[PDB]
């Protein structure tokens, strides 16, 4: 497909068949097909989680700054007292995620092997590609076209970069993301990173 850096030949192993292909691999990680498949799945999951994380730490801050719901900040959301102790929630999350991730791992190892429901035997997932289960996971029945996959990959990459920026710019400056953006917009030439220290 496209070239990430003009004037540079794309790597031979990247043929453009994969969605979201731009030939960006200067360090030679995906020189083996098995590594390519594993890293494709890893890039899907890391980024499918990142989009949700970025939305969760972005939208409530905006809606609170508007003045509709008062919500604690994403860094201070752990100190608040909830209906249950953090340990019980962690244990429940650990068990459920153990189950679902072991199911996904068994799907990755042997494709089309864990499609069948273990309890109600009459229900099974339709056959498809790895990483896109479909079926019940696609309740609205949207076609898994290549353009949609490219859009999803681009959005995931942007979300990963945004999460990294959130973490770094909250570590350096004690304020949150939206207030940092507002402060920068107040005076663009005297509020950048180089102005600080």
């Amino acid at each position: 497909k496209g070239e990430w850096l003009p004037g540079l030949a794309s790597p031979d192993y990247l043929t453009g068949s994969l969605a979201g292909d731009n030939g960006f691999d200067p360090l030679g990680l995906a020189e083996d097909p098995e590594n390519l498949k594993w890293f494709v799945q890893a890039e899907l999951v890391n980024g499918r989680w990142a989009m949700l994380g970025v939305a969760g730490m972005l939208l409530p801050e905006v809606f609170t700054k508007i003045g509709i719901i008062n919500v604690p900040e994403w860094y201070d959301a752990g100190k608040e007292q909830y209906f249950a102790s953090s340990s019980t929630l962690f244990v429940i999350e650990f068990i459920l995620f153990h189950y679902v991730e072991i199911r996904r791992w068994q799907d990755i190892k042997n494709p089309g092997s864990v499609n069948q429901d273990p309890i109600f035997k009459q229900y099974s997932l339709p056959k498809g590609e790895v990483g896109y289960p479909g079926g019940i996971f696609n309740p609205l029945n949207f076609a898994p076209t290549q353009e949609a996959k490219e859009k999803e990959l681009a959005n995931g990459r942007l979300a990963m970069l945004a999460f990294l920026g959130f973490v770094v710019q909250h570590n350096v400056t004690g304020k949150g993301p939206f207030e940092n953006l507002l402060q920068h917009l107040s005076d663009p030439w005297h509020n950048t990173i180089v102005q600080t220290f």
């Binding site: 953090s86 244990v91 190892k109 042997n110």
Partner: protein, 194 residues
């Protein structure tokens, strides 16, 4: 009926034996003699745990304390045992230990003198008076039920031991009562992370 869908079964475990679900990640049973010995030992362990669990559970439901406290009297000098609330005249450490050693050694040696590989696990005859083992159709089902119940009993005994280690001087029943008192604060979480 595998222990994990999509995981290939080992060659030596095909599913003919009762309770055969193809679980052997470490491959400890490749040698047939080792497999036979492991089967016999597993059956013995399952039967022992199945007999032991009600013995732990029936006390602490009545006025008596628990399984751990019932062993305390031997540590104190001149201690005497009790049963159902009545002291036993012949309750003292040396005589009790001697009788237990003699009887258990005799019965274990008599069990071990058997030569037939099948009889070492399912002897039959004078050990089953009711006669449920005559019909071959129900024998496999009964063996499967026994194996599953024995595995559950072993897991229960491990749970009992770990619960006692977590809460010294505490019984399983009072642990269940404490958990039922407030299910959202008294869990394994506060012990896992301190």
């Amino acid at each position: 009926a595998h222990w994990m869908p999509g995981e290939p079964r080992p060659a030596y475990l095909d599913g003919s034996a009762p309770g055969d679900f193809g679980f052997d990640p470490l491959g400890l049973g490749e040698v047939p003699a080792n497999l036979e010995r492991y089967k016999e030992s597993e059956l013995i362990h399952c039967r022992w745990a199945m007999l032991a669990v009600p013995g732990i559970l029936v006390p602490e439901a009545l006025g008596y304390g628990n399984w751990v406290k019932a062993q305390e009297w031997a540590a104190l000098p001149g201690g005497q045992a009790t049963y159902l609330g009545n002291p036993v005249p012949w309750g003292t450490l040396p005589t009790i230990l001697a009788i237990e050693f003699l009887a258990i050694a005799f019965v274990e040696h008599q069990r071990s003198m058997e030569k037939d590989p099948e009889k070492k696990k399912y002897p039959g005859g004078a050990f089953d008076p009711l006669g449920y083992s005559k019909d071959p159709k129900k024998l496999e089902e009964l063996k499967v039920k026994e194996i599953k119940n024995g595995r559950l009993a072993l897991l229960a005994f491990v749970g009992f031991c770990v619960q006692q280690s977590a809460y010294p001087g505490t019984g399983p029943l009072e642990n269940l009562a404490t958990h039922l008192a407030d299910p959202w604060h008294n869990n394994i979480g506060d012990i896992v992370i301190p």
